[PDB]
Amino acid sequence: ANLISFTFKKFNETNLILQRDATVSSGKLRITKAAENGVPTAGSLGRAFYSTPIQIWDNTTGTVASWATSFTFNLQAPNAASPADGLAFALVPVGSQPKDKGGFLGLFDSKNYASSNQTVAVEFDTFYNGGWDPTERHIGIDVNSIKSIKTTSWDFANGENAEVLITYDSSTNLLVASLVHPSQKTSFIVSERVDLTSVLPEWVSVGFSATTGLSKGYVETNEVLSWSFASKLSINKLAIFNLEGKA
Amino acid sequence: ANLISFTFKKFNETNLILQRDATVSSGKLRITKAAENGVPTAGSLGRAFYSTPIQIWDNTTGTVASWATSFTFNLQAPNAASPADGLAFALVPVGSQPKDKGGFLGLFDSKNYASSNQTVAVEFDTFYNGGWDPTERHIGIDVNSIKSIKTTSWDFANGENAEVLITYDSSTNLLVASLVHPSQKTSFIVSERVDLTSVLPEWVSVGFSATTGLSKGYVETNEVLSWSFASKLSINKNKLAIFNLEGKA
Amino acid sequence: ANLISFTFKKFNETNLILQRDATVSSGKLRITKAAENGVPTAGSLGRAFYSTPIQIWDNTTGTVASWATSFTFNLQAPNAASPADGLAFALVPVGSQPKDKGGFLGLFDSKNYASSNQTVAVEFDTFYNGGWDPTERHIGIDVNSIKSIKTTSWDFANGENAEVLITYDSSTNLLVASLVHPSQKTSFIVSERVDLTSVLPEWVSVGFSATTGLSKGYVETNEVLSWSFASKLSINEENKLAIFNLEGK
Amino acid sequence: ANLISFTFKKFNETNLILQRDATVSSGKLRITKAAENGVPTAGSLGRAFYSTPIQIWDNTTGTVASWATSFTFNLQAPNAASPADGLAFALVPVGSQPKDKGGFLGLFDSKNYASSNQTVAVEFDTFYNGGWDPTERHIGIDVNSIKSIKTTSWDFANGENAEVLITYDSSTNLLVASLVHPSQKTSFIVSERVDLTSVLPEWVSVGFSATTGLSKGYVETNEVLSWSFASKLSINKNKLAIFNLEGK
Ligand SMILES: [Ca+2]
Ligand SMILES: [Ca+2]
Ligand SMILES: [Ca+2]
Ligand SMILES: [Ca+2]
Ligand SMILES: [Mn+2]
Ligand SMILES: [Mn+2]
Ligand SMILES: [Mn+2]
Ligand SMILES: [Mn+2]
């Protein structure tokens, strides 16, 4: 079995494939653009991916990798009543370039199922796009589309640290996204079955994507403080994983 | 920083400390009694712990260990209307002995804050005891008492597998327990800020504890299929990604 | 696959099975005796082991585990010309009791092969015993016998830290023991073929064994500063020594 | 602390930087040329490196990273009496290019110390150069030059697998490089004190480098069958146990 693993407690420019407004500055992974004062700017799109590709499944041996990612993100909107849009962990084709800004998070083109994207993502959405989004703040699981196949309720705490964990288990095809605001003691969890072999190609890049809305007033940051990742392609420990990274 | 880590994919008698009705069979950790026909028995009590005690907070340096457990359990009852009582993952003192069966899960004495017990547990409750319990089947966090300081809705699936992840973070003091029934794709989480120094002793036995009800009819299985655990005590002043792939997935 | 791992950067009494003169003081494992002024005492016999037993091979599946261990030890004799005897890493049966003192290190009865012991050990030899030992100080692989099946030259520097790495890989049945004295930038290594199914039982205790001599002058300290250990029992692969040695000390 | 780890048990083109004759076929990283029929070729040079750079020391906090690497290689010659030249594990500048072929192993320019290369390499030497090498096959710690700052006798076993472990402990500045031949139960070890801060840049690429001789007759294969590497860089001021099993 092949392995690949890495833990960032601070972010470095030199080991990431940066795309658009996503830039590293003072340890933090600022995916969107903040003005001189620090106040977030509208119409921003950023993408950041890990330097080495990851094989998530094999064509010949028919085996599927199990993986896990953990990171702490912080969305800071000056006015909670008008923010946009969100941030997402994404597994994306290796030489793949950004898509639609705004409520498409720079990952998808449309709401209808277009497998040509070959994109799985877990979205953390602050802005309710009636076009596809559910009633309130949610954690979505995105497969080829920005219309999330399964979402969960989210108490978005403004400018407060969110620790996340995402795990894929090959033996059950299950995907689990969890989120905690330690400062507020609020916890959340979504779970869904996903076939990686039908969605993503054998080799994918791994990282983040985040955007701000269309309207000028509708501003928020999209900051990731730390990031840990592990993958195991069989030919995946959880207890010994989040302690070298998260804990 | 000191480290401890193990991943049972199948339970073995040889590297656990079994108390009461707890018994290892065909790789399962059956913590409550089952008849010859494979039928859950009433009035049962079990306990299974790890063979090394664990330092969770160091008095001299005031440091606190960050730790993570993951395990798959399975509770099968014949009659959903009358089951009892549930299983629990707990951190007990080094040389701890079992306590009250039934609605106490062999871990606690009374509903009031009894600091003399020194026990932190994450329960998985099936039987509702009005006196202390909430309405529906719940995940509960037990500190020095059976009356959980926080609870949440857990939609108990009968005879189904439940993958469980429980993490304590030292820098945030936050204990987070999360459950998934992969057959149903249903997920359940509860998190509460807990201070270990105030509650638990320096060294602790990490493991399981489970019970059945007062009456004949109130029977269920209290079984653990597999188990992973890791800990990290910082010497001067814990990955969640590489932990559950060596164990859970 | 099944997994067990721990890192001792500082030792503690409670997660250790201690036998005879073996003691733990201020974060150090003093396997042999010491005075209050700091003088090694003769006729000392120490053995310390990890609490949780370890399945090294599984009868039914016919699989043999692959394990690695890395530790730091210091051997300080007052008079270097007359030292005795040395320490050893040893895989011993779970209920085993310390054996013959002196150059037998507490692990064997005779120089001739006797399978009733069921013991694999890697010895670090300061005192050359004419009957079995080769001339110079050595690292020896001991199979049920105090006479090593293979040895290699060792420049034992008195009172210095010695980082050791012992690795067993089942796919080639190869045990590789290596020692570095980082103070004088010296390095030594030994390798031989060993079948664990024959020599050792299924479950074992893993730890240390050290002794002092017979004479009032043949004394040395036998101390272990830090200790790492990991093992992997497969269901139906080599051990990652790259990620281990860093996730060790 | 910051961590990076991986474990190739079969090589893939998709997550490596390949240079010159270096090639991946059927999961075995072949560094130098081998003919269709399996015949090794002279005048070859290969280099393979991991896709992510690795921070071995941080300037701002003075923190230096401990690391470890394990890989199994096989060298096979038609004629053991005349092979060339060898292969080497190296920590290399973030965008470096292959240097002198042949006796220099595609890594160095000359026998004298030139810290412009910024290259720590552990070499595995088949061909004794009467210019800088000891009189036999050797493992050698190379620093900014092809002539080793320390060596040890290696009993090169023709067409036999060789497991290698290289470990750098930053709490002792000690680099230890070993090699075992599992088919013949033989082992070899070298250990020298190397200060990375005066040798290598903050960020380095991590990988392999090999060559064959100038003469046509002097042929061998330079193959790596598996690979593991781990690193740990702290914020302030490495378990070989868990690594070596969690490795290959
Ligand atoms: Ca949206
Ligand atoms: Ca109850
Ligand atoms: Ca002796
Ligand atoms: Ca040469
Ligand atoms: Mn959405
Ligand atoms: Mn309850
Ligand atoms: Mn000897
Ligand atoms: Mn050379």
PDB file of N, CA and C in Angstrom, chain A residues 63-140:
ATOM      1  N   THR A  63      -8.750  -0.814  -6.889  1.00  0.00           N
ATOM      2  CA  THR A  63      -8.762  -0.413  -5.481  1.00  0.00           C
ATOM      3  C   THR A  63      -8.926   1.101  -5.319  1.00  0.00           C
ATOM      4  N   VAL A  64      -9.622   1.496  -4.251  1.00  0.00           N
ATOM      5  CA  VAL A  64      -9.920   2.906  -3.966  1.00  0.00           C
ATOM      6  C   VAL A  64      -9.213   3.350  -2.685  1.00  0.00           C
ATOM      7  N   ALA A  65      -8.555   4.505  -2.733  1.00  0.00           N
ATOM      8  CA  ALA A  65      -7.841   5.031  -1.572  1.00  0.00           C
ATOM      9  C   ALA A  65      -8.791   5.546  -0.499  1.00  0.00           C
ATOM     10  N   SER A  66      -8.380   5.398   0.759  1.00  0.00           N
ATOM     11  CA  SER A  66      -9.047   6.055   1.877  1.00  0.00           C
ATOM     12  C   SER A  66      -8.221   7.273   2.273  1.00  0.00           C
ATOM     13  N   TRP A  67      -8.892   8.397   2.508  1.00  0.00           N
ATOM     14  CA  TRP A  67      -8.199   9.624   2.908  1.00  0.00           C
ATOM     15  C   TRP A  67      -8.878  10.389   4.055  1.00  0.00           C
ATOM     16  N   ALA A  68      -8.199  11.435   4.528  1.00  0.00           N
ATOM     17  CA  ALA A  68      -8.669  12.267   5.626  1.00  0.00           C
ATOM     18  C   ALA A  68      -7.983  13.630   5.597  1.00  0.00           C
ATOM     19  N   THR A  69      -8.763  14.697   5.750  1.00  0.00           N
ATOM     20  CA  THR A  69      -8.184  16.032   5.887  1.00  0.00           C
ATOM     21  C   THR A  69      -8.748  16.822   7.075  1.00  0.00           C
ATOM     22  N   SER A  70      -7.885  17.611   7.704  1.00  0.00           N
ATOM     23  CA  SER A  70      -8.286  18.469   8.807  1.00  0.00           C
ATOM     24  C   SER A  70      -7.630  19.846   8.685  1.00  0.00           C
ATOM     25  N   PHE A  71      -8.418  20.890   8.949  1.00  0.00           N
ATOM     26  CA  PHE A  71      -7.980  22.284   8.823  1.00  0.00           C
ATOM     27  C   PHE A  71      -8.811  23.237   9.695  1.00  0.00           C
ATOM     28  N   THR A  72      -8.215  24.370  10.072  1.00  0.00           N
ATOM     29  CA  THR A  72      -8.921  25.416  10.810  1.00  0.00           C
ATOM     30  C   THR A  72      -9.100  26.655   9.940  1.00  0.00           C
ATOM     31  N   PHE A  73     -10.355  27.001   9.660  1.00  0.00           N
ATOM     32  CA  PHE A  73     -10.658  28.181   8.846  1.00  0.00           C
ATOM     33  C   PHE A  73     -11.404  29.249   9.635  1.00  0.00           C
ATOM     34  N   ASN A  74     -11.338  30.485   9.134  1.00  0.00           N
ATOM     35  CA  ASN A  74     -11.925  31.646   9.798  1.00  0.00           C
ATOM     36  C   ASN A  74     -12.520  32.643   8.802  1.00  0.00           C
ATOM     37  N   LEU A  75     -13.845  32.642   8.691  1.00  0.00           N
ATOM     38  CA  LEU A  75     -14.535  33.612   7.853  1.00  0.00           C
ATOM     39  C   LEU A  75     -14.890  34.817   8.708  1.00  0.00           C
ATOM     40  N   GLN A  76     -14.411  35.986   8.290  1.00  0.00           N
ATOM     41  CA  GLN A  76     -14.646  37.227   9.022  1.00  0.00           C
ATOM     42  C   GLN A  76     -15.335  38.258   8.133  1.00  0.00           C
ATOM     43  N   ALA A  77     -16.622  38.471   8.394  1.00  0.00           N
ATOM     44  CA  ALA A  77     -17.413  39.473   7.691  1.00  0.00           C
ATOM     45  C   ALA A  77     -17.666  40.675   8.600  1.00  0.00           C
ATOM     46  N   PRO A  78     -17.330  41.893   8.126  1.00  0.00           N
ATOM     47  CA  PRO A  78     -17.588  43.117   8.884  1.00  0.00           C
ATOM     48  C   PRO A  78     -19.060  43.249   9.292  1.00  0.00           C
ATOM     49  N   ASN A  79     -19.964  42.898   8.379  1.00  0.00           N
ATOM     50  CA  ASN A  79     -21.400  42.886   8.656  1.00  0.00           C
ATOM     51  C   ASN A  79     -22.003  41.512   8.362  1.00  0.00           C
ATOM     52  N   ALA A  80     -22.422  40.819   9.420  1.00  0.00           N
ATOM     53  CA  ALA A  80     -22.960  39.458   9.313  1.00  0.00           C
ATOM     54  C   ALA A  80     -24.215  39.369   8.440  1.00  0.00           C
ATOM     55  N   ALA A  81     -24.952  40.474   8.352  1.00  0.00           N
ATOM     56  CA  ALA A  81     -26.186  40.534   7.575  1.00  0.00           C
ATOM     57  C   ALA A  81     -25.944  40.457   6.066  1.00  0.00           C
ATOM     58  N   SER A  82     -24.754  40.856   5.622  1.00  0.00           N
ATOM     59  CA  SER A  82     -24.424  40.832   4.196  1.00  0.00           C
ATOM     60  C   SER A  82     -23.003  40.316   3.900  1.00  0.00           C
ATOM     61  N   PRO A  83     -22.811  38.974   3.903  1.00  0.00           N
ATOM     62  CA  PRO A  83     -21.542  38.343   3.524  1.00  0.00           C
ATOM     63  C   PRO A  83     -21.642  37.446   2.277  1.00  0.00           C
ATOM     64  N   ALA A  84     -20.491  37.027   1.752  1.00  0.00           N
ATOM     65  CA  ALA A  84     -20.413  36.134   0.587  1.00  0.00           C
ATOM     66  C   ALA A  84     -18.949  35.800   0.264  1.00  0.00           C
ATOM     67  N   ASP A  85     -18.644  34.550  -0.094  1.00  0.00           N
ATOM     68  CA  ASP A  85     -19.622  33.473  -0.276  1.00  0.00           C
ATOM     69  C   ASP A  85     -19.351  32.267   0.617  1.00  0.00           C
ATOM     70  N   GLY A  86     -18.119  31.769   0.568  1.00  0.00           N
ATOM     71  CA  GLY A  86     -17.707  30.621   1.367  1.00  0.00           C
ATOM     72  C   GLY A  86     -16.354  30.076   0.948  1.00  0.00           C
ATOM     73  N   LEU A  87     -16.006  28.910   1.491  1.00  0.00           N
ATOM     74  CA  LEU A  87     -14.767  28.212   1.146  1.00  0.00           C
ATOM     75  C   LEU A  87     -15.000  26.703   1.117  1.00  0.00           C
ATOM     76  N   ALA A  88     -14.209  26.003   0.309  1.00  0.00           N
ATOM     77  CA  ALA A  88     -14.391  24.568   0.124  1.00  0.00           C
ATOM     78  C   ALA A  88     -13.065  23.827  -0.007  1.00  0.00           C
ATOM     79  N   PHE A  89     -12.971  22.671   0.651  1.00  0.00           N
ATOM     80  CA  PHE A  89     -11.899  21.714   0.385  1.00  0.00           C
ATOM     81  C   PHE A  89     -12.287  20.972  -0.879  1.00  0.00           C
ATOM     82  N   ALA A  90     -11.343  20.795  -1.794  1.00  0.00           N
ATOM     83  CA  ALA A  90     -11.682  20.211  -3.081  1.00  0.00           C
ATOM     84  C   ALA A  90     -10.619  19.266  -3.589  1.00  0.00           C
ATOM     85  N   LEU A  91     -11.076  18.184  -4.204  1.00  0.00           N
ATOM     86  CA  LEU A  91     -10.217  17.273  -4.941  1.00  0.00           C
ATOM     87  C   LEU A  91     -10.487  17.576  -6.407  1.00  0.00           C
ATOM     88  N   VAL A  92      -9.460  18.021  -7.115  1.00  0.00           N
ATOM     89  CA  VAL A  92      -9.637  18.585  -8.444  1.00  0.00           C
ATOM     90  C   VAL A  92      -8.601  17.986  -9.401  1.00  0.00           C
ATOM     91  N   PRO A  93      -8.950  17.820 -10.700  1.00  0.00           N
ATOM     92  CA  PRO A  93      -8.029  17.284 -11.724  1.00  0.00           C
ATOM     93  C   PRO A  93      -6.687  18.007 -11.744  1.00  0.00           C
ATOM     94  N   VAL A  94      -5.617  17.264 -12.016  1.00  0.00           N
ATOM     95  CA  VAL A  94      -4.242  17.702 -11.717  1.00  0.00           C
ATOM     96  C   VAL A  94      -3.802  19.065 -12.290  1.00  0.00           C
ATOM     97  N   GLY A  95      -3.986  19.273 -13.592  1.00  0.00           N
ATOM     98  CA  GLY A  95      -3.634  20.554 -14.203  1.00  0.00           C
ATOM     99  C   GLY A  95      -4.821  21.486 -14.359  1.00  0.00           C
ATOM    100  N   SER A  96      -5.796  21.359 -13.460  1.00  0.00           N
ATOM    101  CA  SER A  96      -7.092  22.027 -13.614  1.00  0.00           C
ATOM    102  C   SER A  96      -7.133  23.477 -13.129  1.00  0.00           C
ATOM    103  N   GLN A  97      -7.766  24.326 -13.943  1.00  0.00           N
ATOM    104  CA  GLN A  97      -7.854  25.763 -13.690  1.00  0.00           C
ATOM    105  C   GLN A  97      -9.232  26.188 -13.161  1.00  0.00           C
ATOM    106  N   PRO A  98      -9.297  27.338 -12.447  1.00  0.00           N
ATOM    107  CA  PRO A  98     -10.500  27.835 -11.759  1.00  0.00           C
ATOM    108  C   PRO A  98     -11.726  27.981 -12.646  1.00  0.00           C
ATOM    109  N   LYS A  99     -12.900  28.019 -12.022  1.00  0.00           N
ATOM    110  CA  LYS A  99     -14.160  28.145 -12.755  1.00  0.00           C
ATOM    111  C   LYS A  99     -14.911  29.435 -12.399  1.00  0.00           C
ATOM    112  N   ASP A 100     -16.144  29.317 -11.913  1.00  0.00           N
ATOM    113  CA  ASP A 100     -16.976  30.499 -11.672  1.00  0.00           C
ATOM    114  C   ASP A 100     -16.810  31.100 -10.274  1.00  0.00           C
ATOM    115  N   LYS A 101     -16.496  32.393 -10.239  1.00  0.00           N
ATOM    116  CA  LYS A 101     -16.466  33.179  -9.005  1.00  0.00           C
ATOM    117  C   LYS A 101     -17.857  33.250  -8.366  1.00  0.00           C
ATOM    118  N   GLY A 102     -17.921  33.740  -7.131  1.00  0.00           N
ATOM    119  CA  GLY A 102     -19.194  33.887  -6.432  1.00  0.00           C
ATOM    120  C   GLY A 102     -19.709  32.595  -5.814  1.00  0.00           C
ATOM    121  N   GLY A 103     -21.025  32.404  -5.875  1.00  0.00           N
ATOM    122  CA  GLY A 103     -21.685  31.238  -5.279  1.00  0.00           C
ATOM    123  C   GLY A 103     -21.407  29.911  -5.966  1.00  0.00           C
ATOM    124  N   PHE A 104     -20.460  29.921  -6.901  1.00  0.00           N
ATOM    125  CA  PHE A 104     -19.967  28.711  -7.551  1.00  0.00           C
ATOM    126  C   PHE A 104     -18.575  28.364  -7.011  1.00  0.00           C
ATOM    127  N   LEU A 105     -18.045  29.254  -6.169  1.00  0.00           N
ATOM    128  CA  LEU A 105     -16.816  29.034  -5.389  1.00  0.00           C
ATOM    129  C   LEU A 105     -15.553  28.720  -6.204  1.00  0.00           C
ATOM    130  N   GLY A 106     -15.620  28.933  -7.517  1.00  0.00           N
ATOM    131  CA  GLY A 106     -14.478  28.717  -8.407  1.00  0.00           C
ATOM    132  C   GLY A 106     -14.184  27.253  -8.665  1.00  0.00           C
ATOM    133  N   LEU A 107     -15.227  26.428  -8.598  1.00  0.00           N
ATOM    134  CA  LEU A 107     -15.110  24.980  -8.769  1.00  0.00           C
ATOM    135  C   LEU A 107     -16.079  24.416  -9.813  1.00  0.00           C
ATOM    136  N   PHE A 108     -17.257  25.031  -9.935  1.00  0.00           N
ATOM    137  CA  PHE A 108     -18.317  24.530 -10.817  1.00  0.00           C
ATOM    138  C   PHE A 108     -18.834  25.567 -11.811  1.00  0.00           C
ATOM    139  N   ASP A 109     -19.392  25.075 -12.916  1.00  0.00           N
ATOM    140  CA  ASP A 109     -19.972  25.915 -13.965  1.00  0.00           C
ATOM    141  C   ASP A 109     -21.484  26.097 -13.819  1.00  0.00           C
ATOM    142  N   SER A 110     -22.182  25.022 -13.459  1.00  0.00           N
ATOM    143  CA  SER A 110     -23.645  25.014 -13.427  1.00  0.00           C
ATOM    144  C   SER A 110     -24.221  24.235 -12.238  1.00  0.00           C
ATOM    145  N   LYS A 111     -25.546  24.279 -12.106  1.00  0.00           N
ATOM    146  CA  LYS A 111     -26.262  23.547 -11.060  1.00  0.00           C
ATOM    147  C   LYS A 111     -26.626  22.127 -11.500  1.00  0.00           C
ATOM    148  N   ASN A 112     -26.734  21.919 -12.811  1.00  0.00           N
ATOM    149  CA  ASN A 112     -27.012  20.589 -13.351  1.00  0.00           C
ATOM    150  C   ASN A 112     -25.768  19.702 -13.382  1.00  0.00           C
ATOM    151  N   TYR A 113     -25.989  18.394 -13.257  1.00  0.00           N
ATOM    152  CA  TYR A 113     -24.920  17.397 -13.171  1.00  0.00           C
ATOM    153  C   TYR A 113     -24.055  17.360 -14.433  1.00  0.00           C
ATOM    154  N   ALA A 114     -22.838  17.886 -14.317  1.00  0.00           N
ATOM    155  CA  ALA A 114     -21.858  17.830 -15.396  1.00  0.00           C
ATOM    156  C   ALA A 114     -20.589  17.160 -14.887  1.00  0.00           C
ATOM    157  N   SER A 115     -20.477  15.858 -15.143  1.00  0.00           N
ATOM    158  CA  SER A 115     -19.352  15.057 -14.648  1.00  0.00           C
ATOM    159  C   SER A 115     -18.004  15.412 -15.286  1.00  0.00           C
ATOM    160  N   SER A 116     -18.045  16.188 -16.371  1.00  0.00           N
ATOM    161  CA  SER A 116     -16.842  16.642 -17.081  1.00  0.00           C
ATOM    162  C   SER A 116     -15.888  17.463 -16.204  1.00  0.00           C
ATOM    163  N   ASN A 117     -16.435  18.117 -15.175  1.00  0.00           N
ATOM    164  CA  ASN A 117     -15.635  18.827 -14.170  1.00  0.00           C
ATOM    165  C   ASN A 117     -14.726  17.877 -13.404  1.00  0.00           C
ATOM    166  N   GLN A 118     -15.276  16.704 -13.074  1.00  0.00           N
ATOM    167  CA  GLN A 118     -14.616  15.680 -12.255  1.00  0.00           C
ATOM    168  C   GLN A 118     -14.167  16.264 -10.915  1.00  0.00           C
ATOM    169  N   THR A 119     -15.115  16.827 -10.168  1.00  0.00           N
ATOM    170  CA  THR A 119     -14.807  17.547  -8.935  1.00  0.00           C
ATOM    171  C   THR A 119     -15.680  17.109  -7.763  1.00  0.00           C
ATOM    172  N   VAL A 120     -15.029  16.729  -6.664  1.00  0.00           N
ATOM    173  CA  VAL A 120     -15.693  16.519  -5.376  1.00  0.00           C
ATOM    174  C   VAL A 120     -15.231  17.650  -4.474  1.00  0.00           C
ATOM    175  N   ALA A 121     -16.157  18.226  -3.711  1.00  0.00           N
ATOM    176  CA  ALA A 121     -15.815  19.272  -2.748  1.00  0.00           C
ATOM    177  C   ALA A 121     -16.771  19.312  -1.568  1.00  0.00           C
ATOM    178  N   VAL A 122     -16.261  19.759  -0.428  1.00  0.00           N
ATOM    179  CA  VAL A 122     -17.085  19.994   0.748  1.00  0.00           C
ATOM    180  C   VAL A 122     -17.141  21.495   1.003  1.00  0.00           C
ATOM    181  N   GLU A 123     -18.312  22.083   0.772  1.00  0.00           N
ATOM    182  CA  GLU A 123     -18.478  23.533   0.873  1.00  0.00           C
ATOM    183  C   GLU A 123     -18.904  23.979   2.267  1.00  0.00           C
ATOM    184  N   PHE A 124     -18.487  25.192   2.628  1.00  0.00           N
ATOM    185  CA  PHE A 124     -18.862  25.814   3.889  1.00  0.00           C
ATOM    186  C   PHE A 124     -19.451  27.183   3.593  1.00  0.00           C
ATOM    187  N   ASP A 125     -20.763  27.186   3.389  1.00  0.00           N
ATOM    188  CA  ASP A 125     -21.475  28.268   2.726  1.00  0.00           C
ATOM    189  C   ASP A 125     -22.162  29.239   3.689  1.00  0.00           C
ATOM    190  N   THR A 126     -21.791  30.517   3.586  1.00  0.00           N
ATOM    191  CA  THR A 126     -22.409  31.598   4.366  1.00  0.00           C
ATOM    192  C   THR A 126     -23.566  32.277   3.634  1.00  0.00           C
ATOM    193  N   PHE A 127     -23.529  32.254   2.301  1.00  0.00           N
ATOM    194  CA  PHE A 127     -24.481  33.012   1.485  1.00  0.00           C
ATOM    195  C   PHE A 127     -25.513  32.136   0.767  1.00  0.00           C
ATOM    196  N   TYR A 128     -26.789  32.437   1.012  1.00  0.00           N
ATOM    197  CA  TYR A 128     -27.905  31.628   0.517  1.00  0.00           C
ATOM    198  C   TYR A 128     -28.315  31.984  -0.914  1.00  0.00           C
ATOM    199  N   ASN A 129     -27.764  31.240  -1.872  1.00  0.00           N
ATOM    200  CA  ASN A 129     -28.159  31.346  -3.272  1.00  0.00           C
ATOM    201  C   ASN A 129     -29.394  30.492  -3.517  1.00  0.00           C
ATOM    202  N   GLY A 130     -30.559  31.135  -3.518  1.00  0.00           N
ATOM    203  CA  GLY A 130     -31.839  30.447  -3.714  1.00  0.00           C
ATOM    204  C   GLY A 130     -31.862  29.520  -4.917  1.00  0.00           C
ATOM    205  N   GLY A 131     -30.966  29.780  -5.869  1.00  0.00           N
ATOM    206  CA  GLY A 131     -30.841  28.977  -7.078  1.00  0.00           C
ATOM    207  C   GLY A 131     -30.551  27.508  -6.826  1.00  0.00           C
ATOM    208  N   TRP A 132     -29.926  27.207  -5.687  1.00  0.00           N
ATOM    209  CA  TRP A 132     -29.545  25.834  -5.364  1.00  0.00           C
ATOM    210  C   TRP A 132     -29.415  25.550  -3.864  1.00  0.00           C
ATOM    211  N   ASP A 133     -29.152  26.588  -3.072  1.00  0.00           N
ATOM    212  CA  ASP A 133     -28.875  26.428  -1.642  1.00  0.00           C
ATOM    213  C   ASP A 133     -30.114  26.139  -0.793  1.00  0.00           C
ATOM    214  N   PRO A 134     -29.921  25.487   0.373  1.00  0.00           N
ATOM    215  CA  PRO A 134     -30.973  25.264   1.364  1.00  0.00           C
ATOM    216  C   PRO A 134     -31.242  26.495   2.223  1.00  0.00           C
ATOM    217  N   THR A 135     -32.234  26.380   3.103  1.00  0.00           N
ATOM    218  CA  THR A 135     -32.782  27.505   3.865  1.00  0.00           C
ATOM    219  C   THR A 135     -31.748  28.369   4.600  1.00  0.00           C
ATOM    220  N   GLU A 136     -30.824  27.735   5.317  1.00  0.00           N
ATOM    221  CA  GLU A 136     -29.846  28.475   6.127  1.00  0.00           C
ATOM    222  C   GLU A 136     -28.383  28.120   5.831  1.00  0.00           C
ATOM    223  N   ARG A 137     -27.478  28.547   6.715  1.00  0.00           N
ATOM    224  CA  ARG A 137     -26.048  28.248   6.600  1.00  0.00           C
ATOM    225  C   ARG A 137     -25.833  26.737   6.662  1.00  0.00           C
ATOM    226  N   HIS A 138     -24.972  26.214   5.796  1.00  0.00           N
ATOM    227  CA  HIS A 138     -24.874  24.767   5.627  1.00  0.00           C
ATOM    228  C   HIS A 138     -23.468  24.266   5.321  1.00  0.00           C
ATOM    229  N   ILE A 139     -23.252  22.970   5.542  1.00  0.00           N
ATOM    230  CA  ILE A 139     -22.058  22.273   5.059  1.00  0.00           C
ATOM    231  C   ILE A 139     -22.506  21.350   3.932  1.00  0.00           C
ATOM    232  N   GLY A 140     -22.061  21.634   2.715  1.00  0.00           N
ATOM    233  CA  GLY A 140     -22.501  20.865   1.558  1.00  0.00           C
ATOM    234  C   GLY A 140     -21.466  19.877   1.070  1.00  0.00           C
TER     235      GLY A 140
END
